[PDB]
Amino acid sequence: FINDRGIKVLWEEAYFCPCLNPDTGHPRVDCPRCHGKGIAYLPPKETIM
Amino acid sequence: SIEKKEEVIAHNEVVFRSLTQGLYVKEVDIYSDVVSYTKDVDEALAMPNTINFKNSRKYKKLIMNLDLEPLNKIQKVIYETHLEGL
Amino acid sequence: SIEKKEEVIAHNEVVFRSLTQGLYVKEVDIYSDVVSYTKDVDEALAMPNTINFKNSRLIMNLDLEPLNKIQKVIYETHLEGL
Amino acid sequence: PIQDAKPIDDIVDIMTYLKNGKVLRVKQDNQGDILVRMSPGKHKFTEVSRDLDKESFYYKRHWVLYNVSVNSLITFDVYLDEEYSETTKVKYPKDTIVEYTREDQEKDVAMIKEILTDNNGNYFYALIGETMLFDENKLNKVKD
Amino acid sequence: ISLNPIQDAKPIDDIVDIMTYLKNGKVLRVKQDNQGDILVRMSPGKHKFTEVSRDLDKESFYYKRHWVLYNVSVNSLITFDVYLDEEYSETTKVKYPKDTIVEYTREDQEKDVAMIKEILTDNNGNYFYALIGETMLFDENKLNKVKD
Amino acid sequence: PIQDAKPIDDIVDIMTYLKNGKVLRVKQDNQGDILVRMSPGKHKFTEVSRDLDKESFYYKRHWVLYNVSVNSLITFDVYLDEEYSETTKVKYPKDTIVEYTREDQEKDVAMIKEILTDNNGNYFYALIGETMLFDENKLNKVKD
Ligand SMILES: [Zn+2]
């Protein structure tokens, strides 16, 4: 039923990037893992939703 | 007689030297091509290379340049304790 | 290689160590006789290693190994070629 | 001649190299090149990295898990990473479609499979379904 | 008066051999912890790809196994114990397989621990077990398996 | 020899000791050791305490009610608390699975049941289903 009604979508989990500055507790402006956002992401997974 | 030794890293950055001229870069243009040179390590252009800054993007067109010789500059402080008897 | 280096001596001092236990002096009494001992080399009670201090009071106790202590801190830079 | 490419034919060899732990380089179509690896330690699983450049004091490869499919391995080109040469400086790469005139001055389409050169940099091409060599000027790129 | 020994299905431990069988085209059988037990095959002909099926039985004339493309993962092969179809079968679903360590009651009313080294069944289906340190064969009801 | 352990076999004895009011010590598998007790006063009910160490001026045992099951008592090992020795310093405890070579140099698996020692601390082991002793070196721990 879920596969029948859903739409194909890519799913990637989230995790805090190591680039977070230990003292201010806030991230670097530009690094490959996260492009300014304070959160990184894992490799995509395919799913229907 | 060395009793305790500790090693600490103050800075770690990358400096680029021209193979032919032997100078260090100090400035670059909009395209990141060299605008100026300087024969001083303290004034040379620097890319931060502490652990958080690895795998940068700002100087890709610089690094690929064959005439340039990247150099890893590291500054350190070490503390050495001694005992010399009576 | 080394591009620039300098050595500076932060401190020169005399430290007291017990001959029996080997523990260094942490605290002392009214006349500088020991009341507490500690294993730490650096936290140990210390005084400047100058001639005037000696004349101003090693003197006080017998289970006493008056040791000299020196600190070296070194500033150096390297250019590691590729 | 130039030996810039040493493609692996058998996946069994690829798995054997993976068991040895050597890094691989897998090509993609209209997409970024990728590196593949077998994880060390107790648990063995495939890892991938989007970082192509060589490990260095200023550049460290980033590895993560992935459920890689054999279908990509068996189909796509694969190489040993350290043995790979970034490019072969020729006008038309291998497997590139060109239009050429046959020996009887009749025109046919073909794809290229050859790497030969003198010591000056002059290159020659031999076409799939053909024997003799063809110059950079003689061949004409076939537009998509 | 008994049937000859019956062999246990050997799980394949090393990836290299598994791929080698797969390249030859010999069918594999994988058990997934979550979902199901499946067969794996590399496609016949020149159009090469991996195929998966759930038609878990010998290819009888009246039982045609059906295949569909699937992107099988390397990690799936590594983590999940895999078998060759020619061995894994209903022919033996022995309670205690070979190389299993069991606790068995001895004649001296002492429970000793031993490993099963050979398996055979009588015509009535009762499995006879050979144990290390023992000569005769042992019966399933007599035995006890200690887990953990 | 060493008498560090004096397990109780009959639950009837355990109940009898409980009626006497002496504290018990019950082992658990991959879980903390526990003490058990019968409550004093008008109402008699079982009490438990997660505190193992001996009562002291700095340490007081904490007791609470619980609906203990006989199944744990009848199965798990039980001891008098005060008579219990915390450990027996040997490489392989009792009921530990090891691999040993039999008299005919054929290898078999076994579990250990013995406590013997000289006055220097040299220990010997006798295996379940076996008679003679085996040294610390001869035995080999069987991994789970
Ligand atoms: Zn980041």
In order, the DSSP letters of E72-128 are -BHHHHHHS-EEETTT-STT---SS-TT-EEEEE-TTS-EEEEEEEEEEE-TT-PEE
**C-alpha distance from residue F12 to each of A10, F5, F18 (Å):** 64, 19, 10
A17 is in an annotated binding site: yes
User: DSSP string covering C4-37, please?
Assistant: EEEEEEEEEEEEEE-SSS-PEEEEE-TTS-EEEE
Q: Do E133 and F107 touch (CB under 8 A)?
A: no
* Residue F63 burial class via C-beta count within 10 angstroms: exposed 0-12, middle 13-18, buried 19 and up: middle
CB E96 within 8 A of CB E116: yes
Distance from C-alpha of F32 to C-alpha of B20, rounded to nearest angstrom: 72
D10 contact residues in E (CB cutoff 8 A):
23
Rounded to an integer, what distance in angstroms lies between the CA atom of residue C21 and that of residue C38? Answer: 10
Give the Å distances, CA to CA, from E116 to E9, E121, E130, E141.
15, 14, 6, 14
* Contact in structure between E113 and E146 (CB atoms under 8 Å): yes
- Residues within 8 A of D (CB atoms), E 74-113 only: 74-76, 78-79
3-class SS shares of chain A: helix, strand, coil, % to 5: 10, 30, 65
B53, with CB counted inside 10 A (0-12, 13-18, 19+), is middle
CA distances from B77 to B6, C13, C73, F105 (A): 8, 22, 7, 63
| DSSP per position, chain B | -EEEEEEEEEEEEEEEEETTT--EEEEE-TTS-EEEEES-TTTS--EE-SGGG-S-STTHHHHT-TTEEEEEEEEEEEEEEEE---
Contact residues on chain C for B74, CB-CB shorter than 8 A: 77-78, 80
Quick check: D44 and E78 CB within 8 A? yes
A5 three-class SS = helix
Inter-axis angle of helices D11-20 and E15-24, to 10 degrees?
180
SS3 readout for D119-141: CCCCEEEEECCCCCEECCCCCEE
CB contact at 8 A, F98 and F142: yes
Residues present in chain F in total: 144
Q: Biggest alpha carbon distance in chain A?
A: 49
Subunit contact D64:A32, Cβ cutoff 8 A: no
**E strand or H helix at F48, and its extent?**
strand F46-49
Structure token digits, residue D125:
């091409």
CA of E35 vs chain F CAs: smallest distance (Å): 27
Q: Is A18 annotated among the ligand-binding residues?
A: no
Among candidates F106, F107, F109 on the partner chain, residue whose Cβ is nearest the Cβ of E101: F109
Distance between CA E106 and CA F73 in Å, rounded?
Answer: 27
Judging contacts by C-beta atoms under 8 Å, the chain F residues touching residue E117 are none
Is D68 in Cβ contact with E50 (below 8 Å)?
A: no
Chain D residues with CB under 8 Å of E12 CB are none
The verdict on whether residue A8 carries a ligand-binding annotation is no
Pairing of strands F133-134, F123-126: antiparallel
Residues E113, E101 contacting (CB under 8 angstroms): yes
Nearest Cα to Cα of residue D18 among D28, D8, D27: D8
Task: Identify the closest residue of chain F to E103 by CA–CA distance.
Answer: F110
In eight-state DSSP terms, residue E48 is: -
Kindly state the tokens that stand for D73.
Answer: 């391995």
Contact call for residues A36 and A27 (beta carbons, < 8 A)? yes
Q: Are D100 and D139 in contact (CB under 8 A)?
A: yes
Residue D109: what residue type? V
CA distance F34 to F28: 8
In single-letter form, the type of residue at position F100 comes to: Y
Asked if residue E102 lies in contact with residue E145, where contact means CB atoms within 8 angstroms, the answer is yes
Tokens of B75: 């500054």
What angle is formed at CA C10 by the lines to CA C6 and CA C13, rounded to 5 degrees? Answer: 140
CA angle (B86 as vertex; B80, C6 as ends), nearest 5 = 25
State the nearest Cα–Cα gap between E112 and chain F, in angstroms: 5
With tokens 């099926």, the residue in question is E53
Cα separations (Å) of D57 from B70, C23, C78, E38?
Answer: 10, 45, 14, 47
> What would the two tokens of residue C2 be?
């080394």
CA distances from E99 to B34, E86, E121, F85 (A): 71, 21, 17, 37
Query: Could you tell me which chains touch chain C, where touching means 3 or more CB pairs under 8 A?
Result: B
Place of tokens 């590895």: D63
Length of chain E: 148
Pairing of strands D64-65, D116-117: unpaired
CA distance E71 to E50: 7
Structure-determination technique: cryo-EM
Are E and B neighbours with ≥3 CB pairs closer than 8 A?
no
Q: Do D10 and E23 touch (CB under 8 A)?
A: yes
CA distance D79 to D33: 11
What CA–CA distance (Å, rounded) separates C46 from B83?
Answer: 13
**Is B3's CB within 8 Å of C74's CB?**
no
The CA R_g of chain C, rounded to the nearest whole Å, is 18
**Residue whose structure tokens are 């006879």:** E128
**Surface-to-core class of residue F130, CB atoms within 10 Å of its CB (0-12 exposed, 13-18 middle, 19+ buried):** buried
Q: Which of A18, A21, A32 sits opposite B55 (nearest CB)?
A: A32
Determine which helix (DSSP H) or strand (DSSP E) holds D13, and give its type and residue range. helix D11-20
The SS3 of residue F140 is strand
Give the angle F144-F31-F24 at the CA atoms, nearest 5°.
Answer: 125
Write the residues followed by a gap in chain F (C–N more than 2.5 A).
none
List the structure tokens of F9: 């076999």
Sign for the CA dihedral angle at B17, B22, B28, B31 comes to negative
Residue E39 DSSP code: E
Q: Does A46 touch chain B (CB under 8 A)?
A: no
Over the range E111-131, which residues count as b (16 or more CB within 10 Å of their CB) and which as e?
ebbbbbeebebeeeeebbbbb
User: Do the annotations mark residue A3 as ligand-binding?
Assistant: no
Cα F98 from Cα F113, distance rounded (Å): 11
E133, HSE (Cβ side, Cα atoms, 13 Å)? 23
Which residues on chain E are in Cβ contact (under 8 Å) with D44?
15, 78
Tell me the three state secondary structure of residue C61.
coil
Tokens (6 digits) for A26: 């806030």
In sequence order, what E strands does chain D have? 24-26, 34-38, 46-49, 64-65, 78-80, 97-101, 107-111, 116-117, 123-126, 133-134, 140-141
Chain B neighbours (≥3 Cβ pairs under 8 A) are: A, C, D
Phi, psi of D86 (to 5 degrees): -60, -45
Closest CA relative to residue E42, chosen from E52, E34, E32:
E52
Identify the CA nearest to E69 among candidates D74, A10, A39.
Answer: D74
| CB-CB under 8 Å, B69 with C80 | no
Cβ atoms of B73 and B9 closer than 8 Å: no
Task: Quickly tell me which residue has 């010591």 as its tokens.
Answer: D119
Strand-pair category, C24-28 with B24-28: unpaired
Ligand 1 centroid to residue D47 C-alpha, Å: 20
Q: Are B77 and B2 in contact (CB under 8 A)?
A: no
3-state secondary structure of F112: strand
How many angstroms separate the CA of residue E65 from the nearest CA in chain F? Answer: 39
Q: What three-state secondary structure class fits E21?
A: helix
Under an 8 A CB cutoff, do B57 and A18 touch?
A: no
Separation of D34 CA from ligand 1 center, angstroms?
21
> How far is F59 from F26, CA to CA, in rounded Å?
20
Q: Which residue type does F137 have?
A: N
Separation CA B78–CA B83 (nearest Å): 17
Side-chain half-sphere exposure of D7, counting CA atoms within 13 A: 9
Structure tokens at D108: 């046919």
Q: Chains D and E: how many Cβ contacts under 8 Å?
A: 45
CA dihedral in degrees (A41, A45, A48, A49; nearest 10)?
A: -20
C-beta of residue D46 within 8 angstroms of C-beta of residue D65: yes
Side chain identity, residue C75 = Y
Cα→Cα distances E70→D36, E43, E50, E64, Å: 21, 11, 6, 19
- Please judge whether E78 and D16 are an interchain contact, meaning their C-beta atoms are less than 8 angstroms apart: no
3+ Cβ–Cβ pairs closer than 8 Å linking B and F: no
Residue length of chain B: 86
Tokens 């894992």 appear where? A42
Q: Is the Cβ pair D66, A32 closer than 8 Å?
A: no
- Structure-token match 């990295």, residue found: D49
